[PDB]
Design goal:
Chain B: Its main location: host cell. The complex is a heterodimer. Chain A is α+β, with helices and mostly antiparallel strands. Chain A contains eleven helices and twelve strands. The chains are: A alpha+beta, B alpha+beta.
Chain lengths: 312, 717
């Protein structure tokens, strides 16, 4: 059973932050509100490894008064430490991205996410609608806009469960994804007890390039802290899925990068698996918000942080 | 025939020091008095005093100092250097010896006090000073000093100076570097504004050796350049002294945080060079002392003028600074305990004081050791309540006993005793005196350990009589030291008027018994003992030797002692410790107490998260004596801020590396502060307190441990 495996193989550890403390935790442990939102153009610090080391040297000349890129997080009425970006209006914490060319790195405060998701956005029952909607779909900056890999920041909280799956007809794939959805939400109800997850209405965002990426909100009112906690969530969802009708956990670590949707090495494009009880344009549109894509995106009073899943 | 005038000495300054012909054991000092008549018009007076090698050694504390050493140390002030940090003890000893010789060879001098001054017209020096019969003194007038100087020391020079002495305070490194290359002060920038009651003086300088960019006022309206010809006896020729006589003010006043010592050293150095560039006179001594002239620094801020310009300056409270200047002849804090006796005279006095005591307290002095138990204490961890608990203090007892035993051993040269006695009498009424004594008594006992031994023995006698009387006045001394002690009564915890009666009767009985015992040991007191009831309490809990918390269950008043207060975070920690102890002892087992204690710790850590980026909040003060983690040369580029570092170094831990918050400009930009480290230290203190409370009120051996790795570490790591 999945109930028994959860009862005997995970040690939930949660702390209930309240009110002002919880709001401070969200704002200081999750990306700034502006970092998510699409912008007319990108502001950031985008360069290869060597030139990035040089820019970091210049910033470390300016602050006295390659994991440091993710570490350069801050607060400020005065602009933060990362403002290396050379723009004052930056807000932290920022997304930090890995790029292939040669390896490049970007620390971005804004981006044109419209141009990233524009080639793959759209204007019966649930299964047929999903199949139909799915059927209906160089320098540092440019090669940024070709591929990007989100870098896991061990200093930020996790708001999206983001699974990388490495697995044939398309009928089988879509039906298997629906069963995957049911199993994963059984797992989520187990792991996240205080939340009312409706097993057939809770969003799972499926992206196919066989290679899949599954993206779920962490249910309110939780956030997840820790690479080990996310590894445990992944283990539980893997077990829940493998104990339901079918026919990677090393990605959660400080500094490890994960290919984002709408980016190539094949391009990750939405595969719409509508929940059985949805009420669907918003689901399709949300497949394009970067807040379903990043580990550390802001969620949408009490906040029960799950910070440990112990066990031998 | 000597001419007498009713004057008042505004300041006593050291002008010249030399050695007369064919002299090898005694030197001479020419001392400059800034005096003022009733009308306040300043006049300049001089005196010549003689010091032998034995007096210098006695005021030095050892036989290392030579008269030839003082001669070269005082000729070396050509005013480009900063000599008194080559040997600060030398200069303190020389200043104290000259003042003692001046009081011994010319008369009882007193700053800001009516004196009759008589001088010899043939020689020109003041020959005898006496205490004037009558006359209202002139009012000591102040001037407001603002002095800011930008001095370009190479940071690697400071790096090397600190590398030679790892615990060096960086103000001392700044001054040592200025001493190495004095031109740094000449080619520095300086803005100075001096506001007296008459006009405003102001100068702004780009190179302090070049004409001012900004001028406002003349330099002849602050001061007056006086040439006075003197004939120092036993020396060949007439010699002319050129002095500055401050019109309508007697001392400067400088603010606390803005105070910079190299700024004033450079400013006075330029004043000295300007005034004494004209030939045909004598160049004064250029000497300054302060906490910043010792490698390990010094706790109390000041800087004393020994020589040019000739008048004080206060790094401030202004009334108290003036009173401490006047009552101590201006030698404190400059000379230290030398303002009472020469250190080499403290052994004998101690011996004499020992010889005059009753044999029992004689043996108690003979055997005294710091850890020796004296009375029936409470042996922590312990808890009392609901009882009537009282705290008592003998306010100022150690200073009183030091003064008394000094006058007892006076059979071992006593104006210092008179100053100490006036301080003791003044402490009950004006707090500058008590604040002085708090530093003076430990420094005196640091001069000689026999004094520690004597004073601890007499304190043991006081403790023994307190216990004896406590037995008979319904009192059990549960803890304390002897000058402050707390205990409990055998009176009904419900009758409060009876309580107050018993407290008062016990207070009178103990005061009488201690006074009688000190009197029988011939230890006479300069003002009679007062036993202060610090407070009445109902419960008390003791967890360490000095860790104790008192609660009064009827008006909800507490007192906490033994809890470290080394930062704002520890202040908040103390606050929550007292709140949670209020709740815990109002709960009248261990389970509910632990629940309340963990709630307190959790709430503490959340509120700490709300201050997760405040550098000043989480910074702890490290003393020159604890180990301190160094920092790369970046702190060595702080500049002027390095000078306001004489005792304490505030340090944060960021992500773990230390940061001296005060050495860098503002706003600080830092990685997130390592709140985990700081909270771990704070919680270690809190667990000591809580473990003691649990073991005292309920006898549980299960210590209080608050799990931090689990449960609320994730917020920071």
């Amino acid at each position: 059973n999945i109930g028994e495996y959860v009862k005997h193989n995970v040690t939930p550890r949660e702390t209930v932050l309240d009110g002002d403390t919880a709001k401070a935790y969200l704002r200081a442990r999750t990306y700034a509100p502006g970092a998510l939102t699409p912008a007319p153009a990108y502001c950031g610090a985008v360069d290869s490894a060597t030139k990035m080391m040089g820019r970091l040297a210049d910033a470390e000349k300016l602050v006295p008064r390659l994991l440091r890129l993710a570490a350069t997080e801050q607060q400020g009425p005065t602009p933060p430490a990362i403002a290396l970006i050379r723009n004052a209006a930056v807000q932290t914490p920022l997304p930090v991205y890995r790029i292939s060319m040669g390896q490049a790195f970007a620390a971005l405060a804004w981006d044109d996410w419209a141009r990233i998701t524009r080639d793959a956005r759209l204007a019966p029952d649930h299964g047929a609608l999903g199949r139909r909607l799915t059927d209906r779909i160089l320098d540092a900056g440019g090669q940024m806009y070709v591929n990007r890999n989100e870098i896991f920041n061990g200093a930020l909280a996790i708001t999206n469960i983001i699974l990388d799956l490495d697995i044939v007809p398309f009928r089988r794939l879509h039906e298997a994804l629906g069963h995957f959805r049911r199993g994963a939400l059984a797992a989520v109800q187990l792991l996240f007890p205080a939340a009312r997850v409706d097993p057939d209405a809770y969003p799972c965002y499926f992206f196919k390039s066989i290679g899949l990426r599954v993206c779920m909100p962490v249910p309110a009112p939780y956030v997840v802290h820790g690479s080990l906690t996310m590894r445990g969530v992944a283990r539980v969802i893997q077990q829940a899925v493998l104990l339901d009708d079918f026919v990677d956990t090393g990605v959660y670590a400080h500094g490890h990068s994960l290919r984002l949707p709408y980016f190539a090495k094949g391009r990750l494009l939405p595969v719409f698996v509508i929940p059985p009880a949805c009420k669907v344009p918003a689901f399709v549109a949300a497949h394009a918000d970067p807040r379903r894509f990043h580990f550390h995106a802001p969620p949408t009073r009490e906040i029960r942080v799950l910070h440990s899943l112990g066990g031998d | 025939d000597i001419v007498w005038v009713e004057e008042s000495v505004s300041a006593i300054t050291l002008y010249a020091v030399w050695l007369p012909p064919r002299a090898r054991e005694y030197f001479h000092a020419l001392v400059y008095f800034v005096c003022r008549n009733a009308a306040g018009e300043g006049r300049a007076r001089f005196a010549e005093v003689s010091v032998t090698a034995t007096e210098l050694r006695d005021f030095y504390g050892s036989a290392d100092v030579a008269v030839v050493a003082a001669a070269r140390a005082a000729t070396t002030p050509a005013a480009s250097p900063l000599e008194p940090l080559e040997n600060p003890t030398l200069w303190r000893a020389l200043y104290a010896c000259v003042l003692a010789a001046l009081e011994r060879q010319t008369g009882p001098v007193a700053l800001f006090a009516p004196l009759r001054i008589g001088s010899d017209p043939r020689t020109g020096l003041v020959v005898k000073v006496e205490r004037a019969s009558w006359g209202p003194p002139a009012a000591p007038r102040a001037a407001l000093l603002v002095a800011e100087a930008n001095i370009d020391i190479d940071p690697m020079a400071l790096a090397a100076r600190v590398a030679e002495h790892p615990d060096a305070r960086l103000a001392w490194a700044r001054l040592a570097a200025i001493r190495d290359t004095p031109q740094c002060a000449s080619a520095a920038s300086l803005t100075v504004n001096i506001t007296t009651g008459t006009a405003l003086f102001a100068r702004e300088y780009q190179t302090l050796a070049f004409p001012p960019i900004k001028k406002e006022g003349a330099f002849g309206d602050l001061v007056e350049v006086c040439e006075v010809g003197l004939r120092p006896r036993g020396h060949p020729q007439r010699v002319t002294a050129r002095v500055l006589l401050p019109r309508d003010y007697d001392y400067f006043v400088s603010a606390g945080e803005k105070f910079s010592a190299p700024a004033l050293v450079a400013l006075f150095r330029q004043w000295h060079t300007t005034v004494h560039a004209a030939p045909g006179a004598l160049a004064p001594v250029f000497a300054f002392l302060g906490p910043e002239f010792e490698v390990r620094g010094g706790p109390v801020p000041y800087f004393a003028v020994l020589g040019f310009p000739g008048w004080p300056t206060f790094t401030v409270l202004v009334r108290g600074a003036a009173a401490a200047y006047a009552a101590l002849l201006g030698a404190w804090p400059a000379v230290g305990a030398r303002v009472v006796l020469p250190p080499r005279a403290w052994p004998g006095v101690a011996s004499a004081a020992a010889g005059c005591l009753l044999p029992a307290v004689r043996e108690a002095v003979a055997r005294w050791h710091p850890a020796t138990k004296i009375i029936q204490l409470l042996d922590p961890p312990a808890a009392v309540g609901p009882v009537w608990t009282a705290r008592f203090c003998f306010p100022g007892l150690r200073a009183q006993l030091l003064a008394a035993l000094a006058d007892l051993g006076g059979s071992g040269g006593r104006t210092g005793l008179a100053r100490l006695d006036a301080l003791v009498v003044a402490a009950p009424s004006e707090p500058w005196a008590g604040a002085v004594l708090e530093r003076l008594v430990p420094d005196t006992c640091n001069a000689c350990p026999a004094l520690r031994q004597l004073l601890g023995g007499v304190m043991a006698a006081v403790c023994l009589q307190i216990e004896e009387t406590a037995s008979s006045v319904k009192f059990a001394v549960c803890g304390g030291d002897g000058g402050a002690f707390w205990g409990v009564f055998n009176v009904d915890p419900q009758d409060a008027d009876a309580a107050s009666g018993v407290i008062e009767d016990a207070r009178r009985a103990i005061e009488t018994a201690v006074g009688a015992v000190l009197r029988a040991n011939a230890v006479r007191l300069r003002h009679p003992l007062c036993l202060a009831l610090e407070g009445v309490y109902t419960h008390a809990v003791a967890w360490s030797q000095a860790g104790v918390w008192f609660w009064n269950s009827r008006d909800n008043t507490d007192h906490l002692g033994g809890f470290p207060l080394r930062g704002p975070a520890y202040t908040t920690a103390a606050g929550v410790v007292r709140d949670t102890l209020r709740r815990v002892l109002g709960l009248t087992d261990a389970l509910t107490a632990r629940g309340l204690m963990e709630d307190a710790c959790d709430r503490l850590i959340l509120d700490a998260f709300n201050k997760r980026l405040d550098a000043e909040y989480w910074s702890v003060r490290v003393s020159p004596f604890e180990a301190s983690d160094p920092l790369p040369p970046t702190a060595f580029r702080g500049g002027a801020l390095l000078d306001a570092e004489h005792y304490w170094r505030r340090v944060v831990r960021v992500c773990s590396v230390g940061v001296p918050v005060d050495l860098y400009p503002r706003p600080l930009v830092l990685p997130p502060v390592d709140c985990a480290h700081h909270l771990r230290e704070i919680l270690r203190e809190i667990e000591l307190v809580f473990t003691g409370v649990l073991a005292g009120v309920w006898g549980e051996g299960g210590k209080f441990v608050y799990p931090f790795d689990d449960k609320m570490s994730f917020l920071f790591a």
